Design an enzyme around this catalytic site. Structure first.
Site, PDB file in Angstrom:
ATOM      1  CB  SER B  16     -30.701 -88.269  -3.320  1.00  0.00           C
ATOM      2  OG  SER B  16     -30.387 -89.637  -3.287  1.00  0.00           O
ATOM      3  CG  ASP B 245     -33.986 -96.545  -6.280  1.00  0.00           C
ATOM      4  OD1 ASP B 245     -32.969 -96.490  -5.564  1.00  0.00           O
ATOM      5  OD2 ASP B 245     -34.482 -95.496  -6.794  1.00  0.00           O
ATOM      6  CG  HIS B 248     -32.067 -93.506  -3.754  1.00  0.00           C
ATOM      7  ND1 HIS B 248     -31.952 -93.920  -5.064  1.00  0.00           N
ATOM      8  CD2 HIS B 248     -31.504 -92.268  -3.691  1.00  0.00           C
ATOM      9  CE1 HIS B 248     -31.331 -92.976  -5.766  1.00  0.00           C
ATOM     10  NE2 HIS B 248     -31.037 -91.966  -4.955  1.00  0.00           N
TER      11      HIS B 248
END
Ligand code: 79J
Ligand code: 79J
Ligand code: 79J
Ligand code: MG
Ligand code: MG
Ligand code: MG
Lengths: 325, 330, 325
Positions: B16, B245, B248
């Site tokens: 991601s 967070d 990430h």
């Protein structure tokens, strides 16, 4: 002086002599680092890749450029590899495959296989002597392989107890096909390789001679007819006797390949070719060294300063005398 | 100063944090344009790509060079992913996968599977908890997967009510394999992933540490042992706390990656490597600007021109004196 | 002045007008050598490739950059290609396909198909009018196609005597799908194409208008909405009448493409783009020729030498006069 394109947009397509990752270095002919993609497998060839012996080692170049150094292993294909009625000749199958690896926009894909009944999927060494996927048919049926409009080559091997192709009784063994096929009254086992798809053919290669320890079989000998063919060191067409064994590690082949892959300062980005002759190859441009020009400016400025000094002193000297006059 | 190869012959292999086309920018770590091919999928990894969760997102680099920034998601594989008897350990399966992505000439291809009876092809979430292709065998049979001579890794998951491998009773769950296998007395459902084929291994990569918000599982932790491993910003081994967070958007990782990908004027065509230290990188040759040399010539010419006439005037001044002196009576 | 990336890291995605290896040169619009990978096939399109007419000719770019010159053939898809209930519209299917070819990290892979009973694998021309792979179900069953989480598009064509999708009665014909599907009470034959997988979308392209000999269908006309769209010579939107026939070989299209592919001395390695305007394109660096700078130094050095001589004479003359005084 031959210069081979040694660059990341090039794929080297080889056999054990180039299988740097997996072959004892003593048996290598390619002993210099290749800056492109290396696809080379001990024992493999463009025909042998379809046999099932090396089920994960199909050649799949995706680059604009290629260099081929293979063929000797394809001479282990013989009469039993073109014995199924209507199969291609090995001469014709090899020509299409070498054209595709050299020039082709190619893929390796699953080949369609079907039948009028559901065949049993399994694996066996009974058809070829080593383990491959087969369909087993327990009663006579229509079996179909490939699809209309296809563009590529696939291999078939059968162990049939009955069957015919267009009324011609089948013969057990193998064949290469580049068209769909239909077997009638077929009972037994059938192996079908993946398809080496050959579509457009505007990619580019060099085809380096691959020599055997005996004279080449006809279907590989004929690669000499392709414009891209380039001779490699050989003794009457046979692999030189200066290697690790009669088939690998030739000192003279090693030197030929290393020299051609290490031409200095070639700007491969500026030529649309998989090789060039050294004097004609485009050369890297280097930074301009301005040191000499600057040293000349500095020296000139020094002397002009000296003249400036001398002129003013002579002006005062002339004044000194005229005052006296 | 680290310079990462930012060039069309390089594939960035990510999750991601690099999935620029599908992940909100607040969660990205790769926030600079990558001039190569980007293969990065939210939630994926080199083990997880075999799970069936992302059936279209297998990693398939075909370029000479690679940069890897993934692994954190592979720590969701656990004991139940290596529980089928004779399975590879996760340590060894991941080692083979990370080596293949880094150095390998790789493919993703269908895995052979067969049996002594015809199996029913369907899809179900009963084997793994999410939908995958399965074969269902409603009576006990011989099941075969893979082929002698294969070179690659595939994943198997089973929900069996009977079966054994070489006489060892099967255990429901998954395993990774790089050889053919045979199950006897098998009844139930079997999932088989495609094969991540690894053939030759002369391609090149950098392997950037992918940190989790907890300590890495052993099978990703061991990637430190590979020559290509390069540390990325982390706090005691865990992902930094300066992001969107816990997993990430790290400010410091972003700066580390952006800096390494924006080294100026590197001629990547002249180095056979996925990275170089800046001072050692080959530099682009630029057009020579001769303006300063031309300015210096002109300044010199102006002064020399002045000298020509200054000299001319001194010559006339002297000659005056000579002429005047000549008239002095002897 | 448009310059198109003509470089080995670029794939040209075309139809007959670019199918240099298989189409007579008189029908080509791409009549100059393309230094990248050429994937162009007579009759093909990003939708038509899924029809079953092109079993070996799916588009599979793997390069960072692409140039697209296709679409005219996709205008033969029509209502019967989006008639299965819950099918995508052609507008939306084409948008996803052209975006994927342009920007996508793409693959072509086998599409999952299963059922509650064993389907019979065969081939037939009964579903589409030409031979393709099918499953035959001779009793009613649940049929499943695709998998949750997939990312791509596939085509389905049916010849069913019964069946529904979520209670909606099926209609025979075709549809495009980018999600898994489930048919209930299905009896008959089903064709399922390979999946054109579109994953990430950070590759880059130019999308050259592909004109037909009538105004474009809606699903290809809408490619004008993409940032990468670039007009090509046309007459009111229709293929120009200055070619070999009404669809091929336009003199003005040829000149447009050749000019854009032959911009001199572009250093494509220095620009992350599939095109640039000539004046803004980075140019190849050439060796600096210092001849004029050297000539200038020499001219200066000559004059300074003269000044040295003249200053010497001035010094001699002043000394002489002082000697006398
Ligand atoms: C068609 C068939 O029954 N093949 C069997 C095969 C064969 O009997 C031997 O001849 C080796 O070829 O051997 C096996 O032990 C094997 O491990 O490959 C099991 C295979 O079973 C299945 C379902 O494929
Ligand atoms: C083996 C089986 O019957 N799988 C079914 C599957 C199953 O019910 C599990 O997921 C339980 O949760 O669900 C479906 O609705 C689905 O949409 O995938 C249909 C599937 O049917 C066929 C023929 O594959
Ligand atoms: C489902 C079916 O029976 N297909 C047959 C196919 C079909 O009859 C149509 O194309 C004619 O309309 O024709 C064949 O001769 C053919 O050469 O493809 C053999 C095919 O056989 C099998 C088992 O696939
Ligand atoms: Mg010749
Ligand atoms: Mg180390
Ligand atoms: Mg000067």
């Amino acid at each position: 002086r031959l210069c081979l394109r040694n660059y990341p947009d090039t794929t080297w397509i080889g056999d054990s002599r180039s299988d740097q990752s997996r072959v004892n270095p003593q048996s290598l002919d390619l002993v210099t680092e290749f800056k492109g993609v290396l696809q080379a497998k001990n024992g493999n060839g463009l025909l042998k890749q379809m046999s099932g012996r090396f089920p994960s080692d199909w050649y799949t170049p995706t680059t604009k450029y290629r260099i081929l150094y293979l063929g000797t292993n394809d001479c282990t294909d013989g009469p039993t590899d073109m014995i199924i009625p209507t199969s291609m000749t090995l001469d014709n199958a090899a020509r299409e495959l070498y054209l595709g690896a050299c020039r082709g926009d190619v893929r390796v894909t699953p080949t369609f296989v079907g039948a009028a009944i559901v065949g049993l999927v399994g694996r066996t060494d009974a058809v070829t002597g080593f383990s491959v996927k087969v369909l087993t048919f327990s009663s006579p049926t229509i079996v179909v392989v490939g699809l209309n409009g296809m563009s590529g080559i696939y291999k078939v091997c059968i162990a049939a107890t009955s069957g015919n192709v267009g009324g011609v009784k089948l013969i057990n063994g193998c064949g290469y096909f580049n068209t769909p096929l239909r077997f009638d009254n077929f009972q037994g086992q059938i192996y079908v390789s993946d398809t080496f798809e050959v579509r457009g053919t505007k990619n580019k290669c060099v085809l380096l001679r691959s020599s055997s320890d005996t004279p080449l079989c006809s279907h590989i000998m004929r690669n000499v007819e392709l414009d891209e063919y380039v001779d490699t060191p050989n003794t009457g067409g046979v692999y030189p006797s200066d290697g690790f064994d009669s088939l690998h590690g030739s000192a003279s082949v090693r030197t030929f390949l290393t020299d051609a892959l290490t031409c200095p300062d070639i700007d491969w980005s500026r030529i649309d070719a998989a090789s060039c002759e050294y004097d004609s190859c485009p050369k890297m441009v280097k930074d301009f060294d301005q040191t000499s020009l600057g040293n000349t400016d500095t020296l000139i400025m020094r002397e002009v300063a000296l003249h400036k000094e001398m002129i003013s002193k002579l002006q005062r000297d002339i004044t000194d005398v005229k005052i006296r006059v």
